[PDB]
Amino acid sequence: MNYNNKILVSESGLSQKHLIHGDEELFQHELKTIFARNWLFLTHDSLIPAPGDYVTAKMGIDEVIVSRQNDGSIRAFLNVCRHRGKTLVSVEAGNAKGFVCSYHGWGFGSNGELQSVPFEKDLYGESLNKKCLGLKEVARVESFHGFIYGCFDQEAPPLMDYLGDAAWYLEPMFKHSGGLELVGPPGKVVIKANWKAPAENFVGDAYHVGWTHASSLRSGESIFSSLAGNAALPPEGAGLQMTSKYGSGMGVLWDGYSGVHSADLVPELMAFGGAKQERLNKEIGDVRARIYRSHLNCTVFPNNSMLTCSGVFKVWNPIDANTTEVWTYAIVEKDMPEDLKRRLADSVQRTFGPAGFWESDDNDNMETASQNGKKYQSRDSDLLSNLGFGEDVYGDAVYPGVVGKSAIGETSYRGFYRAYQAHVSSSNWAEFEHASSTWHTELTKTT
Amino acid sequence: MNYNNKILVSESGLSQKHLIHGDEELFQHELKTIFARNWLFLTHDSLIPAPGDYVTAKMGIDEVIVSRQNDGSIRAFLNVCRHRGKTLVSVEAGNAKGFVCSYHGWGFGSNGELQSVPFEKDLYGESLNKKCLGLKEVARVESFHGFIYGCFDQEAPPLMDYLGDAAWYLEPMFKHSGGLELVGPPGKVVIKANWKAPAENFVGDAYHVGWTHASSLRSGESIFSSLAGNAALPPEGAGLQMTSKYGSGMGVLWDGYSGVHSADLVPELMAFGGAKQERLNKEIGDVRARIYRSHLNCTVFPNNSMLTCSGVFKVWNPIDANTTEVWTYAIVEKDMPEDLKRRLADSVQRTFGPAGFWESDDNDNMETASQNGKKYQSRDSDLLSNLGFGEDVYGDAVYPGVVGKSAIGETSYRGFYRAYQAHVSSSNWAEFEHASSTWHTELTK
Amino acid sequence: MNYNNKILVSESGLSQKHLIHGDEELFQHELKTIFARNWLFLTHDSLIPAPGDYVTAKMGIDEVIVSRQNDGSIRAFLNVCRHRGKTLVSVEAGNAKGFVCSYHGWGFGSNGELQSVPFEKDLYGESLNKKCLGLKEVARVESFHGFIYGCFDQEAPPLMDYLGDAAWYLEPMFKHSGGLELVGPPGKVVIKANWKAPAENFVGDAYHVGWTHASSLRSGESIFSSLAGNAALPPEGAGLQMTSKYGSGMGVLWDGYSGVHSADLVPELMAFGGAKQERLNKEIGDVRARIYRSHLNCTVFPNNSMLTCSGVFKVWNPIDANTTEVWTYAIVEKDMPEDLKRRLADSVQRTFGPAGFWESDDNDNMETASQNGKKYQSRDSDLLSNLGFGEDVYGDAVYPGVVGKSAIGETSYRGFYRAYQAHVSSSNWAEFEHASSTWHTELTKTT
Amino acid sequence: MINIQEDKLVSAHDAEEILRFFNCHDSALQQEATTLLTQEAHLLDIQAYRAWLEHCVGSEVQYQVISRELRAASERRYKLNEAMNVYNENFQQLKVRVEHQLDPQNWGNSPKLRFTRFITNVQAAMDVNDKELLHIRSNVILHRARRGNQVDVFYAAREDKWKRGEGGVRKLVQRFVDYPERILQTHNLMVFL
Amino acid sequence: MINIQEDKLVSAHDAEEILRFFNCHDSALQQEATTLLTQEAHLLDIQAYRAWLEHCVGSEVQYQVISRELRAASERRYKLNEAMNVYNENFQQLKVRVEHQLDPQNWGNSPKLRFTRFITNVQAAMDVNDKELLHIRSNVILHRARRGNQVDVFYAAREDKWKRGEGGVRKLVQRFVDYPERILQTHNLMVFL
Amino acid sequence: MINIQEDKLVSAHDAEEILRFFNCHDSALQQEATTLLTQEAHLLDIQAYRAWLEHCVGSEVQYQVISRELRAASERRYKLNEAMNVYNENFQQLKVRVEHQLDPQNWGNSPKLRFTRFITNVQAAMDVNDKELLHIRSNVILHRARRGNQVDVFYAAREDKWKRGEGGVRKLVQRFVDYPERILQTHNLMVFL
Ligand code: FES
């Protein structure tokens, strides 16, 4: 396939070829143009708080060691020995000042340096230049209110610029709330779906909720219960959608602070969020303080998704075009009572974890949409994402980014796939930039 | 590999490269030139008899919904939602007037039409053109005495012409008997073989029976029992083999109406076939009535095979070059007594179903011939199909097609792989027709 | 990839690209330039001693029938019927004068000829030319002191010349001991590693032992026990390494005749080898008689490895770039007491078989170095094999080949990968010969 | 007991079967049932099919294994044949299959197959009307290995009826299995469950 | 008993549990335990979840399945949350899960799922302090099949506490499972272990 | 009994073993056998290998697991070594293996492995000559999980001899396994079956 020429994504992101969810060759090309180029979620301050704390994370299909240094900074390294390529670390988290390869015993620091080699002096004498044999390092590591992202491409935009207009919507909860903490260990399950199926679902899909999640809505009695089985439509002005230059976007459901949690947790959550909203009105104004306690369904491009207020935090780790390893954490506001944090964390796993009754409703949707992209008569078919097109705006006085002023639409799909097509047909960030110079105009075109 | 220039099948179908059973890239090319172009078995009238009745079926690796319309016609659609591509139906059969996608609730009719979209008016307003958003339809759907076939290519020949000379041999049992019915549900099993292994085996292989099936022949005491372990050869004039333009072909074993059934069913079947043959002599003459009650081992190109009289009906659904999902049904004459239908159907599954003791004798043959097609030193080797070559005729006064006048031979392999090679090296039906203008001359050379 | 131009191994074999252990397209090209071209281990006289005796063996991914003829010679044939391609033989060993295909009954002789076809006269008449329908035959079948190797390429060098300088080291144990026998049946296990990982490990890796095998060294009390966990370094002059033109090479550990065997067997083995050494001094001199009772860790290019004195004999049968089927046999000296042969064979399997406690310590090394070679950031990384480089010699007065005069080093890696790179970038034996005209000079370059 | 109007996923047939065992859980019957199934599995595992037919199977046996077509949970109109028989055998049909297994020209049985059966969850209850007839339910995991690297594992629930014949020997008179995977991924179902 | 300074791979929790069963192996208790687990698995297998909740589960139940983060065998400093709850349910939380299973708009339950449970290694021991409380340990293999060719097999050790409620019916009051595979390869863990 | 001239697939060794259990199926022996194997499986699963060696294994043990070469069903001439021993251990050889498992520099045991064993089909019968010697036969499914997504399942029939030593404790004196898959697909056979 010629990725320079092939139109995988039509103009304004209105449709995509179904083969994007199944073609193995394109998957291998995404490893170059998507996962080697873009910012990928690594960990949180709360998981590696002290010097020498480390976790292992995926970055695409590569695996990296993410380590808190003695000076408080964070560095991340390929989890691969510089001698004969063995995996250096085989646990998920720990604390150490160095990592010893169990093959020939080469000793690396927490700072990635090759510090010792067994019998160096008798074997290599002075020949071994240890300064050039440190662990391959992730070039860019940056934080967003404690959420740590990595990028292998040194030319990537700063993480804040990469979040673009989406950062404005996230900041009330991520920053003005006092800050979030990530609750580990994550649930981990493999689904037979492309990584883009869940990514698109979380970025912009409020349409599916009442139908796909009808049974979960009706059994649990959460605040959206009345949507079960499409019995009702969310009222005029129930929410909004947005998207941004580098692909991130989200839906906003006004006031839904208890999110998907069942009736048992609703009252405490609604009281906690209402009280904090009342204090934030004075710090950041009514609109931003209301965004804080509004449910955000977001995808941070390419493959990190979240539900603020529900507290679900997801990493769609790519294995091959029909295989994805799903990592599920909980995110909680640091100043909540510890007992409420625990219950919220359990509730996140109950709804969206490995035995999540909401997440399990989505499996067949994700897996068969993905597997149908390998089928001969569907490869060249068009997946549609035109709902709301012609009504999105840019430059609004209140809400930044390309915005669709209604709760249910496909604005965020269009911006996600516009950035995706610009990456896949570019060789580097400069070319992405050149291809994105009219991004908001292309997305608001008919408007 | 350049499929315009690569000789995969030699001249006259005499040999094929062993990589055709193992190469994944040629499997992907077969999707385009074999499975998107030819007629593929879908279902029977007996499995979707009433308005709204539907089954799902595979067409190559694609999966289709095959539905009986209110006017009595049958339409088939890709089992894929027009919105974000979810699989629409997840059961094998049922009855409905529409199909709702459980992802966002789009509702499609049995006729493929997008009939409803949740909250259309508030969400899409007037923007959604539902007329252009019907399910992707199978262009051609046609019946052969109740047996329903589909084809995605609008330029294909009519199904009767595609059967070419094979139809003549099938008509006594499919048409002049009163008609067959297909008994469902099919047994379903995955084997680690290419779809061409079993297809070639059923189309023309009477050679392997006495050796491969020696133990099943000896244990069950069916009418071919004396062949066990190659103890005897079928007598002079025991049968015949034929092949046709578009690839279908079959062997005939005169008079073996109880086919592979064991001794418990032989007498009733033989009496039932002998009586109907006596009535058909007057309708369609001695030859055609005798073909009725003779055992036909056929493959309808590319991947549907059957044993008439034994009543085995197979679909070799391709998964990848070394994986095939085998669907086994029973076919039974509509006017048999219901109790004899039931026993015949259980007997089809007993010998050739998922725990078939005959079909199980073939697994290692199919699977290791297929897997050996991936091995370096065998990719470029030649699989031979030259038995009987030089003795086939065309234009015979009694038996039409390219016919070889003896029971054991490879005439039907050669026709099957000649048609296979003309499709693989052609871009459309017009080029197949130009590559097949001397088909019977190339085979009788 | 273009493999004339694609440079996978740097000059003097100092480093290799990590994708050589994971690239599926290179695996398919190794089938053509490694496994269709070189000599591959088949069997031993001791497993097919009588007329009609046969075994099945792999040659790369192909499977062959290896049969003792009536005249005492050995012939090998593809295990594939000439008719419609069914696997002919489905057992591992037996005795027969012919093989009948169970598909249509074609009957082939032990000499590969098509002897009978069911109902030939009535069906084929005179048309079938049986003389042209014999089983496809391995062109080249040769013996090294009872060890039978096969090669599909009629242009290959004679087996003795292909062993090159390594044959000198092997001959004291393989020939001057009176000869070895192979003890069957082999253990058979599938590992998720590239065939090169174990081949490299056995050819030249003494460095890993003390660290990788620390626990095996410390639990069993063998002669290398003091190396456990890198507590000690083998003394100056403990051993040597060598490599040769066609890739075979080995480490030598002076006097280690009981090899990996635990305390229970040490004293008997040491008495047996010392006594035989004392008689060999007169036949072949002190040096060669000491090589006889010194532990050799060898790989016979490409994928046959062995430990003399420990008695381990391995075949690393390639399945795909991360899958290898490991066959393990024992090798014993023919004149040992039968009860000793039995105990030595069980001890081989105990340490290096399917439940071998030493072999098990290597699994994670092999499997993760192999699997990391598929990961995006590691494909183009360099695996290092420069230990000892600049000290190897050639043309020594005592030890032939390219020789590094110390027990721990990577000389044998360099010579293995130099020959590997010359095969992969050549189309035939003449081109390998042209690319290997300065083989020892390139390897001893800075010496 | 099961209220299948409230317990909406349960079939009428499954609700009947559990009713039979939730009452009577007699210790002597359990031990007899366990012994019967353990010895039957032993014979089958070492491929002593003639002895299995002689000592464990009744002459009036109905040995049946079905595969049921996948239908909508809400289906009420489509009513064509719901299941096909993978097995549906009488004594003589079993004997043909045992002859086929022991025939020396059964090429698929060389090298010899290896079978290991795991029988669990044994429940036993006497029939109300026929006091010589014992209902035994059990689950089986069957592992079949052959030819180096071919491995097939079968899983199922078995509804049996075992009856005292002559000698006082309790023999299999009905086995019914509703095979749980609709598309087999074990190459065939040619094993005795 | 276990000396966990010498038996260095054993956890303190595992050493405690084995101490409870290695002593008292009472025959009547074993048979009661076996009967309880076999009937509970039968109900679950035929998807009678309401009946399971009514007859086998206590109102004070804690139904917990954890997934434990993988850490160095020598780790001593890192002490953040070790495990996450796949399940950590009270009776009402189970009831929500049962309603979600039986809802006719639970699209993933059409065609109906097929479940087969294999319960083995049953051990029973009365609690020292609470004489109405029985500790039952058992191991389960759970096979779930659906939609033609999806097949998921779960494996696990179950540490239960069963208590006599009213009626004299012994009901589940605590189930604890430390799920042995860290990364699930079964699409989800939506089954009742 | 088995007539191996008629039951042609049965080996002489398998015929002998079934003869020993088809007779005596003593209830007290069955319960003792079941308890022995369940406790032994429990110790092994929690990786208490020293305790396993101390409480379940006799000092005269022969712990043996073979892999048998695949030969023609009709083979009668080729008679070279038929099997190799994956295990063939005395007590001291088991001790070296247990040390190797507990050594802190056994890198493959970090993160800790997870083991679950499923023991079924237990048969027990006293030896005719040695009245302190009990023959126990049982089948095992062993699940081994490690390092996130490595999963290895082992299947086998075990032929054991258990003998009363001092204390009256019945201990393992012989275990024989003929491992059913010729080519292992579990990375190794480093588990105690
Ligand atoms: S591979 Fe890590 S020290 Fe050698």
Ligand code: FES
């Ligand atoms: S994918 Fe079918 S309605 Fe959206």
Ligand code: FES
């Ligand atoms: S495939 Fe061997 S005789 Fe036909």
Ligand SMILES: [Fe+3]
């Ligand atoms: Fe959802």
Ligand SMILES: [Fe+3]
């Ligand atoms: Fe056949």
Ligand SMILES: [Fe+3]
């Ligand atoms: Fe090693």
